[PDB]
């Protein structure tokens, strides 16, 4: 259901883009960076609406057949954008405590629907922090040029659908 994944660094810039299974393109690189800068600008102001004028945990369904940690975990994203839905796609956001934002955009629709696309996105943040965090070519906050990263998340797109 998911067809493109981005990751964002904490200083408001794109890190990685892969248009996985859409296979007709019109977007080159810096327009995706325009999306990355604008979602960082949106996620700036998207807490202080405070419309209330005043414990929530995610869960465990075992996405991606083992998994890494079989427990209903916490999440740091208590105030801000989580997901969007339009008539042609839907999009997802997961932040870390450190500051990396973890985009996933899905063309079809896939409560529980945020929670499955949260449970996917803890796995790739584990997979980010084992396969390009431990890499001496990777200087900090740069793009990802590990091909070893890229098929190991390309395998997990077909381990989703």
């Amino acid at each position: 259901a998911i067809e493109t994944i981005l990751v964002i660094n904490k200083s408001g810039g794109l890190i990685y883009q892969r248009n996985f299974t859409n296979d007709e393109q019109k977007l080159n690189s810096n327009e995706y960076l325009i999306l990355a800068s604008t979602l960082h600008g949106v996620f700036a102001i998207a807490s202080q609406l405070t419309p209330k004028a005043l414990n929530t945990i995610p869960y465990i369904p075992y996405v991606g057949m083992d998994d890494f940690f079989k427990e209903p975990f916490t999440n740091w994203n208590k105030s801000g954008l989580r997901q969007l839905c339009t008539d042609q796609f839907t999009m997802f956001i997961y932040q870390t405590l450190t500051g990396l934002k973890f985009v996933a955009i899905s063309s079809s629709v896939m409560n529980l629907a945020i929670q499955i696309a949260d449970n996917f996105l803890r796995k790739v943040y584990c997979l980010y922090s084992d396969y390009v965090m431990k890499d001496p070519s990777y200087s900090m906050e740069m793009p990802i040029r590990s091909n070893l990263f890229d098929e190991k998340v390309k395998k997990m797109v077909e381990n989703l659908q």
């Binding site: 084992d130 396969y131 431990k134 890499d135 001496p136 070519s137 040029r145 590990s146 091909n147 070893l148």
Partner: protein
């Protein structure tokens, strides 16, 4: 017993048990995580790409660490495998090349990485060259190994397992995907002619 001084000392007619620091040396088990040692190796390779010029000098300036601790792991790995210390015996030393590259194959990898490298192939065309392939190398599995300069920790660590053994040896690594096992690395080692000719006296 200094280099400047002689071998001079005193008589045996006393008993000086004033000792400080000597302990056990046995096979302890503490088993740290691969992320921690991977980060140690990670910032080490970061320092070596910082301080060094080009390919080959960086390859030597990686393999020198293996030459530092290869002697050290050789002698008590042999002192544990072929032998406090209420010692029965110490068994046979290196007879030839084919027991000592069995000794990397037998109990060096299973000392380090809890398994065995899958082959110890004697080469076809020559005999000075030998080749060991690890199938899925443990300490460099995260590095995208298109440059094969990052696995010269272990070429340095086996060269210092054979330089004490009296076989000076050109040790290289290549990587070749011969199977569905991907990113398996071949350590095609060589020797010199002379201990090959010391083998070539009689075999």
């Amino acid at each position: 017993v200094g280099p400047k001084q002689a071998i001079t000392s005193e008589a045996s007619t006393t008993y000086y048990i004033s000792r400080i620091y000597s302990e056990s040396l046995l096979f302890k088990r503490q088993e740290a995580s691969l992320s921690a040692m991977a980060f140690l190796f990670q910032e080490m390779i970061s320092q070596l790409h910082r301080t060094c010029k080009t390919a080959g000098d960086f390859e030597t300036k990686l393999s020198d660490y293996g030459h530092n601790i290869g002697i050290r792991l050789l002698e008590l790995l042999n002192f544990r495998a072929s032998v406090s210390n209420y010692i029965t015996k110490m068994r046979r030393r290196d007879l030839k090349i084919l027991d000592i590259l069995q000794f990397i194959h037998g109990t060096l990898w299973s000392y380090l990485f809890n398994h065995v490298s899958d082959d110890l192939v004697k080469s076809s065309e020559r005999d000075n060259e030998y080749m060991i392939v690890d199938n899925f190398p443990t300490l460099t599995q995260f590095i995208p190994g298109e440059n094969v300069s990052c696995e010269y920790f272990v070429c340095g660590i086996i060269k210092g397992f054979l330089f004490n053994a009296g076989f000076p040896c050109g040790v290289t690594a290549h990587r070749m995907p011969q199977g569905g096992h991907s990113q398996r690395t071949v350590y095609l080692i060589q020797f010199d002619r002379q201990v090959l000719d010391r083998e070539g006296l009689r075999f």
